[PDB]
CSV table of C-alpha atoms in Angstrom, one decimal:
chain,number,residue,atom,x,y,z
O,1,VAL,CA,277.0,69.2,116.3
O,2,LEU,CA,278.1,70.8,113.0
O,3,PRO,CA,275.5,73.7,112.9
O,4,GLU,CA,276.9,74.8,116.3
O,5,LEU,CA,280.6,74.5,115.2
O,6,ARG,CA,279.7,76.5,112.1
O,7,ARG,CA,278.2,79.4,114.2
O,8,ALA,CA,281.0,79.1,116.8
O,9,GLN,CA,283.5,79.4,114.0
O,10,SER,CA,282.0,82.5,112.4
O,11,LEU,CA,281.7,84.2,115.8
O,12,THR,CA,285.3,83.5,116.5
O,13,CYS,CA,286.5,84.8,113.2
O,14,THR,CA,284.6,88.1,113.7
O,15,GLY,CA,286.0,88.4,117.3
O,16,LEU,CA,283.0,87.7,119.5
O,17,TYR,CA,285.0,85.4,121.8
O,18,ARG,CA,282.6,85.3,124.8
O,19,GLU,CA,279.6,84.5,122.5
O,20,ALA,CA,281.7,81.9,120.7
O,21,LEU,CA,282.9,80.2,123.9
O,22,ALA,CA,279.6,78.8,125.1
O,23,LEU,CA,278.9,77.3,121.6
O,24,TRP,CA,282.3,75.5,121.4
O,25,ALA,CA,281.7,74.4,125.0
O,26,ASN,CA,278.4,72.7,124.5
O,27,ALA,CA,279.5,71.2,121.2
O,28,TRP,CA,282.5,69.8,123.2
O,29,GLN,CA,280.0,68.3,125.8
O,30,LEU,CA,277.9,66.8,123.0
O,31,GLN,CA,280.9,65.0,121.5
O,32,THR,CA,282.5,63.8,124.7
O,33,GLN,CA,279.5,61.6,125.8
O,34,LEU,CA,277.4,61.1,122.7
O,35,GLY,CA,280.0,59.6,120.5
O,36,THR,CA,283.2,59.8,122.6
O,37,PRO,CA,284.0,61.5,119.5
O,38,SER,CA,283.9,59.4,116.4
O,39,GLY,CA,286.6,60.8,114.1
O,40,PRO,CA,289.1,63.2,115.8
O,41,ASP,CA,289.5,66.4,113.7
O,42,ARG,CA,286.2,67.7,115.0
O,43,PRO,CA,287.2,67.3,118.6
O,44,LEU,CA,290.5,68.9,117.8
O,45,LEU,CA,288.7,71.8,116.0
O,46,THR,CA,286.5,72.2,119.1
O,47,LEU,CA,289.4,72.3,121.5
O,48,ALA,CA,291.1,74.8,119.2
O,49,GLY,CA,288.0,76.9,119.4
O,50,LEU,CA,288.0,76.7,123.2
O,51,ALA,CA,291.7,77.4,123.6
O,52,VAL,CA,291.5,80.5,121.4
O,53,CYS,CA,288.5,81.9,123.1
O,54,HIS,CA,289.8,81.2,126.6
O,55,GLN,CA,293.1,82.9,125.6
O,56,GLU,CA,291.3,86.0,124.3
O,57,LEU,CA,289.2,86.2,127.5
O,58,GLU,CA,291.8,85.5,129.0
O,59,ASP,CA,291.6,82.3,131.0
O,60,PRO,CA,295.1,81.1,130.1
O,61,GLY,CA,294.6,78.3,132.6
O,62,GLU,CA,291.5,77.0,130.7
O,63,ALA,CA,293.3,77.5,127.4
O,64,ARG,CA,296.2,75.4,128.7
O,65,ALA,CA,293.8,72.6,129.8
O,66,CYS,CA,292.4,72.6,126.3
O,67,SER,CA,295.9,72.2,124.8
O,68,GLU,CA,296.6,69.3,127.2
O,69,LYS,CA,293.4,67.5,126.1
O,70,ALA,CA,294.3,68.0,122.5
O,71,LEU,CA,297.9,66.7,122.8
O,72,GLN,CA,296.6,63.6,124.6
O,73,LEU,CA,294.2,62.9,121.7
O,74,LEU,CA,297.0,63.6,119.2
O,75,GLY,CA,299.4,61.3,121.1
O,76,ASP,CA,296.9,58.4,121.5
O,77,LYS,CA,297.0,55.6,119.1
O,78,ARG,CA,293.5,56.2,117.7
O,79,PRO,CA,293.2,54.7,114.2
O,80,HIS,CA,290.4,56.8,112.6
O,81,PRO,CA,287.0,55.0,112.4
O,82,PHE,CA,287.3,54.4,108.6
O,83,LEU,CA,290.6,52.4,108.9
O,84,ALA,CA,289.0,49.1,110.1
O,85,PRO,CA,286.1,49.3,107.6
O,86,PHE,CA,288.5,49.8,104.7
O,87,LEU,CA,290.9,47.0,105.8
O,88,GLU,CA,287.9,44.7,105.9
O,89,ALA,CA,286.5,45.8,102.6
O,90,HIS,CA,290.1,45.4,101.2
O,91,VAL,CA,290.4,41.9,102.5
O,92,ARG,CA,287.0,40.9,101.2
O,93,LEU,CA,287.6,42.6,97.7
O,94,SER,CA,291.0,40.8,97.4
O,95,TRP,CA,289.1,37.5,97.7
O,96,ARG,CA,286.5,38.3,95.1
O,97,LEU,CA,289.4,39.2,92.7
O,98,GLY,CA,291.8,36.3,93.7
O,99,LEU,CA,294.4,38.7,95.1
O,100,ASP,CA,296.6,38.7,98.3
O,101,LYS,CA,295.0,39.4,101.6
O,102,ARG,CA,297.7,39.0,104.2
O,103,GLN,CA,299.0,42.5,104.8
O,104,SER,CA,295.5,43.9,105.1
O,105,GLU,CA,294.7,40.9,107.3
O,106,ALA,CA,297.7,41.1,109.5
O,107,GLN,CA,296.9,44.8,110.1
O,108,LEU,CA,293.3,44.1,111.0
O,109,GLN,CA,294.4,41.4,113.4
O,110,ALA,CA,296.8,43.8,115.2
O,111,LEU,CA,294.1,46.4,115.6
O,112,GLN,CA,292.0,43.6,117.1
O,113,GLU,CA,294.9,42.0,119.2
O,114,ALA,CA,295.5,45.4,120.7
O,115,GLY,CA,291.9,46.4,121.2
O,116,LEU,CA,291.4,49.2,118.6
O,117,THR,CA,288.4,47.8,116.8
O,118,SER,CA,285.9,45.0,117.2
O,119,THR,CA,286.3,41.5,115.8
O,120,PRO,CA,283.9,41.7,113.1
O,121,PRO,CA,285.0,45.4,112.6
O,122,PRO,CA,282.3,47.9,111.7
O,123,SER,CA,281.5,47.9,108.0
O,124,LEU,CA,281.9,50.5,105.2
O,125,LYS,CA,278.1,50.5,104.8
O,126,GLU,CA,277.4,50.7,108.5
O,127,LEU,CA,279.6,53.8,108.9
O,128,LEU,CA,278.2,55.2,105.7
O,129,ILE,CA,274.6,55.3,106.9
O,130,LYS,CA,275.3,56.2,110.6
O,131,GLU,CA,277.3,59.3,109.5
O,132,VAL,CA,275.3,62.5,110.1
O,133,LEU,CA,275.5,65.1,107.3
O,134,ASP,CA,274.5,67.9,109.6
U,1,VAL,CA,279.3,69.8,98.2
U,2,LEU,CA,277.1,68.6,101.1
U,3,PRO,CA,273.8,68.6,99.2
U,4,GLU,CA,275.2,66.1,96.8
U,5,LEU,CA,276.6,63.9,99.6
U,6,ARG,CA,273.5,63.7,101.7
U,7,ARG,CA,271.5,62.9,98.5
U,8,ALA,CA,274.0,60.2,97.6
U,9,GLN,CA,273.8,58.8,101.2
U,10,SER,CA,270.0,58.5,101.1
U,11,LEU,CA,269.9,56.6,97.8
U,12,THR,CA,272.6,54.2,99.2
U,13,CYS,CA,270.5,53.6,102.3
U,14,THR,CA,267.4,53.1,99.9
U,15,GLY,CA,269.3,50.5,97.9
U,16,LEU,CA,269.4,52.5,94.7
U,17,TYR,CA,273.1,52.0,94.0
U,18,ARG,CA,273.5,52.9,90.3
U,19,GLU,CA,271.7,56.3,91.0
U,20,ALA,CA,273.8,56.9,94.2
U,21,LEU,CA,277.1,55.9,92.5
U,22,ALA,CA,276.5,58.7,89.9
U,23,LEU,CA,276.1,61.2,92.7
U,24,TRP,CA,279.1,59.9,94.8
U,25,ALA,CA,281.3,60.0,91.7
U,26,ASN,CA,280.3,63.6,90.9
U,27,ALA,CA,280.8,64.6,94.5
U,28,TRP,CA,284.3,63.1,94.3
U,29,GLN,CA,285.4,65.2,91.3
U,30,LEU,CA,283.9,68.4,92.7
U,31,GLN,CA,286.2,67.9,95.8
U,32,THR,CA,288.9,67.7,93.2
U,33,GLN,CA,288.1,71.3,92.4
U,34,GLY,CA,291.3,67.0,106.3
U,35,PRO,CA,290.5,63.4,105.2
U,36,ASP,CA,286.9,62.8,106.0
U,37,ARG,CA,284.7,64.0,103.1
U,38,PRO,CA,287.2,62.2,100.8
U,39,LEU,CA,287.2,59.0,103.0
U,40,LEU,CA,283.4,59.1,103.1
U,41,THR,CA,283.0,59.6,99.3
U,42,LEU,CA,285.5,56.7,98.8
U,43,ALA,CA,283.3,54.6,101.2
U,44,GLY,CA,280.3,55.6,99.1
U,45,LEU,CA,282.0,54.6,95.9
U,46,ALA,CA,283.4,51.4,97.4
U,47,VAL,CA,279.9,50.4,98.8
U,48,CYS,CA,278.1,51.1,95.5
U,49,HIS,CA,280.8,49.6,93.2
U,50,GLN,CA,280.6,46.5,95.3
U,51,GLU,CA,276.8,46.2,95.2
U,52,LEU,CA,276.8,46.7,91.4
U,53,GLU,CA,279.4,44.0,91.2
U,54,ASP,CA,282.3,46.1,90.0
U,55,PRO,CA,284.7,44.8,92.6
U,56,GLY,CA,287.8,46.2,91.0
U,57,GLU,CA,286.6,49.8,91.1
U,58,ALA,CA,285.7,49.2,94.7
U,59,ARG,CA,289.1,47.8,95.5
U,60,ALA,CA,290.7,50.8,93.7
U,61,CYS,CA,288.6,53.2,95.8
U,62,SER,CA,289.6,51.2,98.9
U,63,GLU,CA,293.2,51.4,97.8
U,64,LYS,CA,293.1,55.2,97.6
U,65,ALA,CA,291.4,55.3,101.0
U,66,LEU,CA,294.1,53.1,102.6
U,67,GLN,CA,296.6,55.5,101.0
U,68,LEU,CA,295.0,58.6,102.5
U,69,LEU,CA,295.0,56.9,105.8
U,70,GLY,CA,298.6,55.8,105.7
U,71,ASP,CA,299.7,59.4,105.5
U,72,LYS,CA,302.8,60.1,107.6
U,73,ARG,CA,302.5,63.9,107.8
U,74,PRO,CA,302.0,65.3,111.3
U,75,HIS,CA,298.4,66.1,112.1
U,76,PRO,CA,298.0,69.8,111.1
U,77,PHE,CA,296.8,70.6,114.6
U,78,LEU,CA,299.9,69.1,116.4
U,79,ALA,CA,302.3,72.1,116.0
U,80,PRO,CA,299.7,74.8,116.7
U,81,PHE,CA,298.8,72.9,119.8
U,82,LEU,CA,302.4,72.5,121.0
U,83,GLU,CA,303.1,76.2,120.4
U,84,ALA,CA,300.0,77.1,122.5
U,85,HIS,CA,301.2,74.6,125.2
U,86,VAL,CA,304.7,76.0,125.4
U,87,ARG,CA,303.6,79.6,125.4
U,88,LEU,CA,300.9,79.1,128.1
U,89,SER,CA,303.2,76.9,130.3
U,90,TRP,CA,305.8,79.7,130.3
U,91,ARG,CA,303.2,82.4,131.1
U,92,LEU,CA,301.9,80.2,134.0
U,93,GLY,CA,305.3,79.1,135.3
U,94,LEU,CA,304.7,75.4,134.4
U,95,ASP,CA,306.9,72.9,132.7
U,96,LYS,CA,307.3,73.1,128.9
U,97,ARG,CA,310.4,71.1,128.4
U,98,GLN,CA,308.7,68.0,126.8
U,99,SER,CA,306.3,69.8,124.5
U,100,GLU,CA,308.9,72.4,123.5
U,101,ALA,CA,311.4,69.6,122.6
U,102,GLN,CA,308.7,68.0,120.4
U,103,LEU,CA,308.0,71.3,118.7
U,104,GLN,CA,311.7,72.1,118.1
U,105,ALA,CA,312.2,68.7,116.5
U,106,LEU,CA,309.3,69.3,114.1
U,107,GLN,CA,310.7,72.7,113.3
U,108,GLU,CA,314.3,71.5,112.7
U,109,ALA,CA,313.1,68.7,110.4
U,110,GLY,CA,311.0,71.2,108.4
U,111,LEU,CA,307.7,69.4,109.5
U,112,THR,CA,306.2,72.8,110.5
U,113,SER,CA,307.0,76.5,110.3
U,114,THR,CA,309.6,77.9,112.6
U,115,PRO,CA,307.2,80.1,114.3
U,116,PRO,CA,304.4,77.5,113.8
U,117,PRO,CA,300.9,78.2,112.5
U,118,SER,CA,298.7,79.5,115.4
U,119,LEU,CA,295.4,77.9,116.5
U,120,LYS,CA,293.5,80.9,115.1
U,121,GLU,CA,295.0,80.4,111.6
U,122,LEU,CA,293.7,76.8,111.4
U,123,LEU,CA,290.4,77.9,112.9
U,124,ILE,CA,289.9,80.4,110.1
U,125,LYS,CA,291.1,78.2,107.2
U,126,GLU,CA,289.0,75.2,108.1
U,127,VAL,CA,285.8,74.6,106.1
U,128,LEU,CA,282.7,73.2,107.6
U,129,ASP,CA,280.5,73.4,104.5
């Protein structure tokens, strides 16, 4: 998705809003099914691209829809994918070193007791390799 | 920085941790010169330090990561987005009271600029390489 965002970004910065819009729009579609997102600065960047291009073009209605979607994402209690893998690595590394686990534990058992990550959470290594460097 | 990170990732997947650590660590101090590349480098360091049985460096790395993630600053996109929402709602004769109240509170507390940054500003300033 990043080569497309790259091009959409340059096009938008030059002022080719209509050319840019389609690129942001397909990148949005990619993310929304094939990942839901993953980590939410890229969705937000995409929606910012859409909102700007729609305003310039000017579908203020479509721009307002983009803003709504963004504010929902921003308002939702969505942890960031790396928070669970780090809590787990921190609980584990505290054991290896004979140190306290219970604030990192209690936090991982609240993300679990409220549904925000799996019991066994994803691991640092899992997310490391699955991350695309595009 | 990306060449160094993808090269580090592939050695980590290959199981060559000492080699990959050297790259992750160098990629870290080049970023010294949006928490995702940092978080990922720290995950690279924490995974390699751990495999090489340097658990303390790994825990240190994971400590920074938990710091970066505990950040209490508003998401940078929040204010630009409220501004856009208020402006567009007014233009279109729709309700802006809630979003405007939220923006005004951020402005009053000094958590954003008093005409906030625009969506275009953040679009420009963001780096994808």
